[PDB]
Amino acid sequence: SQLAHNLTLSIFDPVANYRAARIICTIGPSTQSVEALKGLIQSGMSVARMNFSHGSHEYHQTTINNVRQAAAELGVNIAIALDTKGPEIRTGQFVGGDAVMERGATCYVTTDPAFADKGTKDKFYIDYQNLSKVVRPGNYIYIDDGILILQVQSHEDEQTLECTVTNSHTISDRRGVNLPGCDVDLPAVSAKDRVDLQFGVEQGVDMIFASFIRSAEQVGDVRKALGPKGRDIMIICKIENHQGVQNIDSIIEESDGIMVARGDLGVEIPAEKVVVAQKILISKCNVAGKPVICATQMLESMTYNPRPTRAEVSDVANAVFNGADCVMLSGETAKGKYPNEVVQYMARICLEAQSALNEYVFFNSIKKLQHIPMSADEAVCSSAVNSVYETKAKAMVVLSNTGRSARLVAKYRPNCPIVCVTTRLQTCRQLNITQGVESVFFDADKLGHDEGKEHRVAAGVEFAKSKGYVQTGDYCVVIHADANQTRILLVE
Template sequence: MRRAKIVCTMGPAVDSLDALRSLVEAGMDVARLNFSHGTAEEHRRRVEQIRAVSLELKKPIAILQDLCGPKIRTGFEGPSLVEAGATVSLVEGSSGSADTIAIDYQGLTEDVRPGDRILLGDGQVELEVVLIREFRVETRVLHGGAVRSRMGVNLPSKRVRLSALTDKDRRDLEVGLDIGVDLVALSFVRHADDIRELRQLMEVHGRVTPIVAKIETPSAVEQIDPIVRAADAVMVARGDLGVELPPEMVPVMQKEIIGTCRRHQRPVIVATEMLQSMVDAPRPTRAEASDVAGAIFDGADAVMLSAETATGSYPLRACAMMDRIIRQAESSRFYNPLPSEPGDSTPEAIANAACDVAKTIHASILVALTESGGTARLISKARPPAPILALSPDEKTLRRLALYWGVIPRYLDMSGGDVDQLVRRASGVLKELGLAQAGQRFVMTYGAPIGLRGSTSAIRVELVR
């Protein structure tokens, strides 16, 4: 079975029940809702469709809300073309002129210094700050090109004081929590305080949801340790990260971020342009296939498809291709998933001991009976050779576990039964899923009393009945 998970972005290309059903069957584990696009009603409808397909196929699918974040853009009525070597002025506001580009960021003159780079259109146009006046910034064009209204602007400077949460994000968060998203991704995180601010806002709404910190700025890279500790999961968002950092640094940063997440026991998603050519072509380039495999070898818990599934011509092929690449990488002799550094808590001791027992007796699978999902997450972090079946009566727990490496989340009614009855029920699920046959051994973790959150304290070796 495949251990790493697949995140697929929703969009017009998969905007029907049939397409979603096929996408889940092709391997989707997490559905990403990009709140940079679409209305609240469109997102609500998609959540309902995903839930319906998930119920039909009996496969929990996590829904990830991706907040837009503070995107700086050019204004209107500026120059249509700038040439290398020319001098161009930047002003704060919405309207420019023949030789002036308007930028919709009110902190521009305070946050840049002479020598800083300013990038337009994902780096297609590169400017260097020469002089800062009271209301404008004079720049020299390093790389020229077309300038359009509403182009994205990147300020790689670590001095940018933008809040990670915009007014739109606050409204979108309320929508996401109301429609029941399972994870919330925060864009352009710069400090751990950004994560804490989002969590406090969730508390105000009375619904705290796991937070995925998107690493896409030099500031975030510099603050990676406290950010990872504050977040519940991390996304290596290579789009803006690759604009604000030199391209040759991105593979190095990817490895370092994944390593930091492994040390702090946080799942990590690698994203952006993984199979980009499949937006238009039925097959990926060899370099893209190597990119996906490289993320798996680096230790990623999940890899993500963006435009490939949202607006591409071959969304199902892209997901199926990613599934095949992951399986091939994980079955190779080069794949050596390293466990996270173990902690000293009782639940971690139980999880690690269960993995050791399973390895010693060559158990076919690990089974975690869990209310909150905590034990299954800890077993996942230990990277056991056997797959992990997480059984829970809590649908929300099961959906959130869909992101975790090696975890197969499935529903199990734990009411009105002792441990022996639960072993029989678990055996039934194992046989139904084709994960084990009668007479094969499995290792099971559970708590006493059964059904109490955070009570996992026992390990049991059983035969599939």
Template structure:
């Protein structure tokens, strides 16, 4: 089961219910809505379609609304424009239709923000211009690197600080729309400082809302302030497109690794984005370099991988998701990945929940458990479990629908919805039964469960339980050490001793000294006799054979030929063959 999540940008190539269903089946966990494009009406219809398909497939899908931010973009062009090196081209704040001589930008302060000799990059650096002169509202440039100029493409000023509001009027309108639509999380573009995030948080809180904020790291100031930004957000996106223009391209891989490492240490979900399978916008297979890029992001420890144009307007949206999922799955299955993740696993911090999460993942690994079940109401404890990268699925059971959607971006966490339960014991029992009914676990599995007495409070998780998924048939006093699996042989009469086969587990009223030879064939004894001085207990100690004494109605409680597992440490007898430590 793939643990690295996949975020898909939704656009014209995949906005129908049929295409969305195919995306989800291919591996999409989160749907991204790019608010730089389309209308609120279009996005509202998208949200309806996403939720309809998600419910129909019974697969939680988070909805990430990506605010445009103070992105400087050129306007629209009235005709196809090809810029050639050496050509003079005008960037102007005058509202003119774009052509091969000039194009409009709506950012009024741009002429005052540039100077002769400065570089302007358009369309993620595909086109490079050098400022020659500024005349009023016109910026006269010389084309250094040409190409086709396209509508609404972004303009970057590398390593320059432009005094623009971090939250635009459009962002506020889009945010209000998102809050009204109850989107799962909101991504803030061009974050520079922690205060930018807090400004957005205040707007959200002033509207009596609570929605996770994902900070997009795409400015050089954000890299400088990364520690403070991580402390005030719910998630991070490494937006490598604009980031690779803002800082030298050679630094991007190292910055990516640094940011992912810091997020992992703080249990903050991190998304790696931009140009991951860019060639699949046009081609049915990626380049080898792109496949390696995806795998390396997984090795880095990213929570999620993001597709942009590949799914939004590319020719192969479904195949792009399938390809990304396949690369991530293969990477996670490799021994190199397991060693890399183990070497990067952070030490637990000084908190109860963090310590319980660490102990949970360690116990699951040492006991060879099949799953982790985390009962959570805020998602906090589930993200702490994710921090320690368990190599088995971790199911976050919650009755909070918002938390279910929020956890779709967290590594290795698979959210499950549960109804209300009266107390902690009922919560644990119902969580196990729910995971059983959905086929996530099966009878015979060993699971590690975390929960908290202080339910609903972030950091309230303080309980860990090792749980065998099986029916408890009986309990007595165990003698000897270890776990025994075998077939029950009911010994109700002296003649029944002759039925014992090597390895059977015999259920008797009391041991018979005259049938020691037959008893030796057994692997364990279940006896109605009580106490350490009973003959069954003595035989067990003398023959170094596991025994459970004091089982009432042992010869009638079990069926002849039944498969059982005995845990002599607890004195429990389980129906069926199950995985227990000490087996």
């Protein structure tokens, strides 16, 4: 029945008047100014990502301020995301900053700290103390973004591995390393992260994009690192290796969402398996009711070219068809030449794919997996979305203080916009990673506690009127969950 829906499509018919997918932009040189962040919002940015791989706290403080000021000038709410550096496995130094590794040659990798600066083509340092304890003969070591492949022959001692060089490649100082068939037990957060996170709390960030997540226990470590004052910040887990993939179920349970880092996974896993891994992860998140980001290598060529390749375009479309809440831009907005154009084009592709997407298959698929008896909240939200399909309603209004019920509704995928009416600002921002949802702040301090709920509902319906989703005569499905309620409202 996606198939059936395909039969009735016409590419000349008008696209939807709404875009369900959300866009995350990485901020850097090309876009850190208030006037550029402004052009980014208008192009369709909902989330601003700061990459703490680079920059000092000083640089990001500017991004924060520039974001908060861009948003407030445009009257909108924009999420601020902190993407951590995370633990790294790297080489040490080489004599003459360099070491020409030739295919067939033998070399020795050592965890012996003495060799940190005096590396040679023959014996050099890798900074991960457990290397020997975790690698075994036959396994591979990737150095320099997977380019250099060394095969492990044996242990020279308990600190040194004898390796065959399997392919020629020159490598220089401090290259990154990957262990494709190895369970890496680095801690969850690096000493730096712990400081960067602490900073994030202090500065009131919305979500952590947590690097190199490999197990559920590690999500706890990240949480415990955000400490007692960080309990409302969302942890979005970056899945970057086989471990993340193997442990996905338990990781999804503990976390608040998922980022599929295709490029990182790609270093260690064949591209065609990463495609499939994207499918699995997006679908698990859809079923769990948690946002999922499709990240890296999205419209990469458009970092320096005016238009992207055909294949990059289908890549973006097919992330939407897979079920991504979000698509992310990295270099294309951090240091690209067409930062507005890329966001605009991404929005257009998403919008096109959404018009081809049969949402009803999602609703069905997710509803079919519910255990009977359902809990009240699951029942109210799914029947609310069912009511949309059955009455052809044209908007939904969701009253939610923490975003929870808005995410519960969005999970069921109605074929019309969801308007969340909330009394928390951080909620309006945090929902920026949830597909199909738009927020409205309701100031309970100034406008009253609305214990009746009539004002928030009215605020909801008016919001949907200005945007032109509903007009007089259309239907609109209202929901307050947690005590609960549902109404099918005729619009006046």
